[PDB]
């Protein structure tokens, strides 16, 4: 990778999220979203390293802080949609063409730390909150499918979550140091999803009744010793990090144990590998994989970008000194975008 461009956003506030749109066809505009302060900004990637500003959403609340964003598409028209959330704990669905707010979801009792769309169902949106729970929403019928948390759920703020390849299971992590598994391919969850598609408040006077899931399908506190702020599936394996200068590759149970055979009482974990680095000992720093899960990227607190080939390389620029909070690869992995604490955006091309 070579650094081809850089720009600064006028708000001069930290940028906490960056996401390229992976739902666009080949030869169509290369677009990414950045989130920081009360703003959501769209950019187009052109030839010769040109970054063109498309649109900006400025929230009506000046005190709102966006912490996360996720792309989806309307199942009926295949048109892109963008979900954003932060400190207010309100989910907002944006139309990227008009950059106007379509609908909004209220429910979480505190800030939203991450949003993730289901890999097979574009209508299924997952949120992770400071209130200690995870929520599953159906954005087509505007229903809360389930709440993941309670008695045997997270005991402190949830910082990250990820669906597996097919969206049969979720792995969540947080300030309680634990990594918790939640199966969504159970009869209870499959039926709750099916029923959320049959709901309409116009044909009934009774509300939709969400599943209150109190118990996870696996739980460990043996991987990290501080806040677990990023988690991602890599096949049946897990990649997770704390603020202890390492990304750990692990799996529940023993070496030969199948993930779908793991019982909720499983006391063992297997460490498979460790991705070691420096100067990334602060809270709230994400790692990211490309679409094909062939590349891994992580920014550090002094502006350096680490890139590993999963099949280390350091990327540095003398004008890049601020913490890189998140990174995003373009669908084809030809471009890598980095966002910083000083409101700066950095473009690296292969
Ligand atoms: C520069 S400063 O003023 O000291 C500062 C720094 C960080 C935050 C902050 C950021 N992000 C989140 N949540 C999303 C999140 C969660 C896990 C990993 C992760 C992210 C975003 C990147 O990596 N926050 C929740 N409460 N505070 C925050 C606020 C102020």
UniProtKB/Swiss-Prot annotation:
Gene Ontology MF term list: chromatin binding; enzyme activator activity; identical protein binding; methylated histone binding; transcription corepressor binding
Keywords: Acetylation, Chromatin regulator, Chromosome, Disease variant, Host-virus interaction, Methylation, Nucleus, Phosphoprotein, Repeat, Repressor, Transcription, Transcription regulation, WD repeat
Tissue-specificity statement: Expressed in brain, colon, heart, kidney, liver, lung, muscle, ovary, peripheral blood leukocytes, pancreas, placenta, prostate, spleen, small intestine, testis, thymus and uterus. Appears to be overexpressed in breast and colon cancer.
Modified residues (N6,N6-dimethyllysine): 116, 187, 203
Example GO biological process: negative regulation of DNA-templated transcription
Effect of mutating residue 155 to T: In COGIS; decreased trimethylation of 'Lys-27' of histone H3; no effect on interaction with EZH2
Post-translational modification: Methylated. Binding to histone H1 'Lys-26' promotes mono-, di-, and trimethylation of internal lysines.
Effect of residue 112 to N: Impairs interaction with EZH2
Annotated effect of mutating residue 221 to S: In COGIS; decreased trimethylation of 'Lys-27' of histone H3
N6,N6,N6-trimethyllysine, modified sites: 116, 187, 203
Chain's role: Polycomb group (PcG) protein. Component of the PRC2/EED-EZH2 complex, which methylates 'Lys-9' and 'Lys-27' of histone H3, leading to transcriptional repression of the affected target gene. Also recognizes 'Lys-26' trimethylated histone H1 with the effect of inhibiting PRC2 complex methyltransferase activity on nucleosomal histone H3 'Lys-27', whereas H3 'Lys-27' recognition has the opposite effect, enabling the propagation of this repressive mark. The PRC2/EED-EZH2 complex may also serve as a recruiting platform for DNA methyltransferases, thereby linking two epigenetic repression systems.
Identification of the protein by name: Polycomb protein EED
Origin species: Homo sapiens
The organism's taxonomic lineage, starting at the top: Eukaryota, Metazoa, Chordata, Craniata, Vertebrata
Name of encoding gene: EED
Span within the parent record: 82 to 439 of 441
């Amino acid at each position: 990778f070579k650094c081809v461009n850089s720009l600064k956003e006028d708000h001069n506030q930290p940028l906490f999220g960056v996401q390229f749109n992976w739902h666009s066809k080949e030869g169509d505009p290369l677009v990414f979203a950045t989130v920081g302060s009360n703003r959501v900004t769209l950019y187009e990637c052109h030839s010769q390293g040109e970054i063109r500003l498309l649109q900006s959403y400025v929230d009506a609340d000046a005190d709102e802080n966006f912490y996360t964003c996720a792309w989806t598409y309307d199942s009926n028209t295949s048109h892109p949609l963008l979900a954003v959330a932060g400190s207010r704990g309100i989910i907002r669905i944006i139309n990227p063409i008009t950059m106007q707010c379509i609908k909004h979801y209220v429910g979480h009792g505190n800030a939203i730390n991450e949003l993730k769309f289901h890999p097979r169902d574009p209508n299924l949106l997952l949120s992770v909150s400071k209130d200690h729970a995870l929520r599953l929403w159906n954005i087509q019928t505007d229903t809360l499918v389930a709440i993941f948390g309670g008695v045997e759920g997270h005991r402190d703020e949830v910082l990250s979550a990820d669906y597996d390849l097919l969206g049969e299971k979720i792995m969540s992590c947080g300030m309680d140091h634990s990594l918790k598994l939640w199966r969504i391919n159970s009869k209870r969850m499959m039926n709750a999803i099916k029923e959320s598609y049959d709901y309409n408040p116009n044909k009934t006077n009774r509300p939709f009744i969400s599943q209150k899931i109190h118990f996870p399908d696996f739980s460990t506190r043996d991987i990290h010793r501080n806040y677990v702020d990023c988690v991602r599936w890599l096949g049946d394996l897990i990649l997770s990090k704390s603020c202890e200068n390492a990304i750990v590759c692990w799996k529940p149970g023993k070496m030969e144990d199948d993930i779908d055979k793991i019982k909720p009482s499983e006391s063992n974990v297997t460490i498979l590998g460790r991705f070691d680095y420096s100067q990334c000992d602060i809270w709230y720093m994400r790692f990211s994989m490309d679409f094909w899960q062939k590349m891994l990227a992580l920014g550090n607190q002094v502006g350096k970008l680490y890139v590993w080939d999963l099949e280390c390389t350091t990327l540095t620029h003398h004008k890049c000194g601020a913490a890189i909070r998140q990174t995003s690869f373009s669908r084809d992995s030809s471009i890598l975008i980095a966002v910083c604490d000083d409101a700066s955006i950095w473009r690296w091309d292969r």
